[PDB]
Paper text:
In this study, we determined the crystal structure of the [name] from [name] (MeMeaC) that catalyzes the reversible conversion of mesaconyl-CoA to β-methylmalyl-CoA. [name] functions as a [name], reversibly catalyzing mesaconyl-CoA into β-methylmalyl-CoA, by adding one water molecule. The crystal structure of MeMeaC revealed that the enzyme belongs to the MaoC-like dehydratase domain superfamily and functions as a trimer. The ethylmalonyl-CoA pathway is an anaplerotic reaction sequence essential for the assimilation of acetyl-CoA, which is necessary for methylotrophic growth.
To elucidate the molecular mechanism and substrate binding mode of MeMeaC, we determined the crystal structure of the enzyme at a 1.95 Å resolution with Rwork = 20.9% and Rfree = 27.8%, respectively. MeMeaC is composed of an N-terminal subdomain (MeaCN, residue 1~147), a C-terminal subdomain (MeaCC, residue 191~348), and a bridge (MeaCBr, residue 148~190) linking the two subdomains. Although one molecule is present in the asymmetric unit of the crystal structure, the P63 crystallographic symmetry operation of MeMeaC revealed that the enzyme forms a trimer. In our current structure of MeMeaC, we observed that a malic acid molecule, which is used as a main precipitant for the crystallization, is bound at the active site. The binding site of the malic acid molecule is formed at the interface between MeaCN and MeaCC. The conserved residues, such as Phe71, Ser79, Asn85, Arg142, Asn226, His231, Tyr248, and Gly249, were located at the malic acid binding site. Oxygen of Ser79 sidechain and nitrogen of Arg142 sidechain make hydrogen bonds to O1 and O2 of malic acid with 2.6 Å and 2.8 Å distances. Nitrogen atoms of Asn85 and Gly249 backbones form hydrogen bonds to O4 and O5 of malic acid with 2.6 Å and 3.0 Å distances. O3 of malic acid interacts with nitrogen atoms of sidechains of Asn226 and His231 as hydrogen bonds of 2.6 Å and 3.0 Å distances. Taking into account that a β-methylmalyl-CoA has an additional hydroxyl group at the counterpart of O3 of the malic acid and is not at a mesaconyl-CoA, strong interaction of Asn226–O3–His231 could make the binding of a β-methylmalyl-moiety more stable, which contributes to improving the specificity.
Author numbering:
A (entry chain A), B (entry chain A), C (entry chain A): 2 to 354
């Protein structure tokens, strides 16, 4: 029963993995998520405010939902990962409330050995469901995993093909009918509505967050994400980094929190277009971030909210006033994340019943 | 939309700031507050105990209420602070329960440039309200803030004038009618009641707490307090301290927790007379504290509880058996906080209906 | 009122201590316990899953119950401890739910001075009760405590005599009637039931956890455990270790979490036979663990669950594939804990009403 877990040669294309340890998310998790990342989006922070605008109660931060659903997959898929690399085709179907239980099922949809035959990239489609089987989250990710025995031979290889953009039209049925007049701009922390954003606008978030060892471990276990490279200062000595790698998701959550400085009314996340973990983060490193409007979509059947398509780029140890990005055939050396996603935002303020 | 925040030259006397991100405080926050500071006051720790003595449920620790209400003001007032300096005229109007939402409004009531023209002291009156607009917390604080451009000229300057003591008579209507017979001294951890304290009594708390980097960051984000000097190990290199300053409130909470060793039945805080952040705390530094009875007040219209006026002084890296205080024209070098406040305490144990 | 606490010479055999600060355990504590230790046992993690199998709601992790009940005793017994040493005769009478309040009473049942006359071992029987006085936890522990004055003389000395095994027959009335068919092996993360374990089976847990300073302090205060040696980087300089000792219970919780890798369906703990803190853990040290089946007991009056008797041994900085244990007259140098306990596990999967 000694189980070092699954390695790259153990995956067979088209297998469905029915992940263990479904997770009841409570106001315990909300309070710890708030203290690990410091997000200040009022919909999630204030029940009073959420209720007035047309929610039943504050919904979970969409990234608390995401890290929990991802977490459940880690024991089977990425326990023996060296790094999670990217995402595509992400959809937040349903908002999630404290007391709800989240479960995850993954489908192996790609496998590509690395040239050294020491590792492969595993591609999965992961689907999270509430206790009654209703989908709440769908996404694709790919992660670089260890082979147990490098001399082993990779049966079938397949780099799958993924939409680099989700279609706003399928995100329309996500958020319940809201009241954009009840939405109190002063309590939400910005006057800027759907119509105040221009395609091409660039936003430095200014604020920096230095990440301590204990912070990312406490976050990573909260998600019940077991990837040994987060936790084992002994074993990681024998990796390329030689020390504990911070959960990629920790950077996504930190960048989202910072993004409140300019995008406070992008209150909920509807889907993920593309994401890429460019570079790893270590304890003692400082995160900064900057964002861009790529599209501004109206939602078929709705006038309360539209959708912003956004690109957010995070750095370590480098302010983003100069908007760091590409630099030759690759990124500026300070870039650690490049995330392309749809958020929701209120439209008009005219009171209706 | 790139916003480095408000600087000293941006404040205009008499402006009202209506702060963003109102905060629903849950049993998540209570559990994290308990783990960040270790307070052992039974009223807050045990619903069973609170209910018996005449509360509807355990109330929030008054400093969890305080750090949340302060927190909401930080983005507008002290995001660009170098240090929060003092308090006066603090009143805990109403106890607060899990599920309640807290909002903050501040009034700029003072401005004084520093001699180097690099900084000014900003004086505010901050008022926290529940979701229905009822006041729960009022206080005055002053914080040393950065000027964006030092060559800038300060229009109007005003060091306001503040009562160095709150009047017990206005704290009477705070706590609901309690049962001081139901109050179980063994469960509360002290036999000492209102009548067992003498004016002039001095209490060393003995216990020390060493504060790690991750602890104060996790606490400071829980309060959604954004002051860059807490978080940015890069930017703080260019400050006088050259490293992250620990939230002043973290020291107040730690000193209050330690104070359980001698003041266990000073179960709730009614108001704040004067407070002064004497000196900063850094990661790795050890806190100790000692307290003094300054007054013992009966409350107009009540026999269940009286009010102790208390002075609590915290040190770093120095036990308080010698009761460190002043030392010439200024404090003993180890002193970091000097806090003068009213707490509540049960009187007589005679059972009534 | 300056109280450095109780020292070895202050205990009198046969005294009952009625401990202060009873503790309401909430979903705040559950979420923080989950993030401090990362346990993935589905009964505790998923209400949905617990309810289906025959609980009213997820019960508290038995070690969250244990650390809280132990915590309440620390101010009186072990505030001035150098190290907690062992356990015997542990019984989890009743599972515990969020909202319940826990109180502790201890009986001094042993005292033995150390040869240097600087310290003694104090032996206690500690009993935790819900708010209505019903017992939930009973155990014996012994801890090495400081004498205030070494020249002091120890009146009565007594090393009591303790059963090295609890009897499965008295654990039968602990867990409510469950449904072992409703128990979803895929959601619980193991197909192995009562009947799949063999006496003599050995299980390496593979996974390692490196423990940071802030992690054990945040955990130790959550339990409201005050032992100065956990917290005071100044005072601990003058101890044999010269630095902060990590709560022994932190190692028990970490080893239990790791043990999910092979014992996922040992879902609840019924009692503790023997436990020994072999060696201390420090910040930066990495924990690993391995377990053994010692007995497999059926429960008088029940067919849903049986009892496994288990031995789990934790190490620091040494993988357990070689199953480290004894090595001459004493343990392998890497061993830090040797814990002998009864857990519960489902039997047959045949659906009944």
């Amino acid at each position: 029963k000694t189980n070092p877990g699954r390695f790259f040669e153990d995956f067979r294309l088209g297998e469905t993995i029915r992940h263990a340890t479904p997770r009841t998310v409570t106001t315990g998790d909300v309070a710890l998520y708030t203290a690990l990342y410091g997000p200040r989006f009022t919909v999630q922070s204030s029940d009073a405010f959420a209720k007035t605008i047309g929610y039943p109660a504050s919904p979970l931060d969409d990234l608390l939902t995401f890290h929990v659903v991802f977490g459940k997959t880690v024991p089977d898929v990425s326990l023996n990962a060296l790094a999670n690399l990217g995402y595509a085709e992400g959809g937040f179907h349903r908002p999630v409330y404290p007391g709800e239980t989240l479960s995850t099922v993954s489908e192996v949809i790609g496998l590509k050995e690395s040239s050294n035959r020491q590792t492969g990239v595993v591609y999965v489609r992961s689907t999270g469901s509430d206790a009654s089987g209703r989908t709440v989250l769908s996404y694709c990710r790919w992660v670089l995993v260890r082979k147990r025995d490098p001399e082993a031979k990779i049966a079938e290889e397949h780099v799958p093909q993924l939409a680099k953009v989700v279609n706003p039209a399928d995100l329309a049925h996500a958020l319940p009918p809201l009241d954009p007049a009840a939405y109190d701009n002063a309590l939400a922390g910005s006057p800027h509505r759907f119509a105040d954003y221009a395609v091409g606008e660039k936003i430095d978030h200014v604020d920096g967050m230095t990440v301590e060892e204990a912070e990312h471990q406490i976050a990573t276990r909260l998600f019940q994400n077991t990837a040994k490279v987060h936790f084992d200062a002994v074993a990681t000595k024998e990796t390329k980094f030689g020390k504990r790698l911070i959960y990629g998701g920790h950077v996504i959550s930190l960048a989202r929190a910072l993004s409140f400085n300019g995008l406070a009314n992008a209150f909920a996340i509807g889907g993920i277009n593309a994401g890429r973990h460019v570079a790893p983060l270590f304890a003692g490193d400082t995160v900064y971030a900057w964002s861009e409007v790529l599209e501004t979509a109206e939602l078929p059947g709705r006038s309360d909210i539209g959708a912003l398509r956004l690109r957010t780029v995070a750095t370590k140890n480098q302010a983003c006033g100069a908007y760091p990005d590409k630099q030759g055939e690759g990124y500026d050396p300070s870039v650690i994340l490049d995330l392309d996603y749809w958020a929701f935002i209120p439209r008009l303020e005219h009171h209706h019943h």
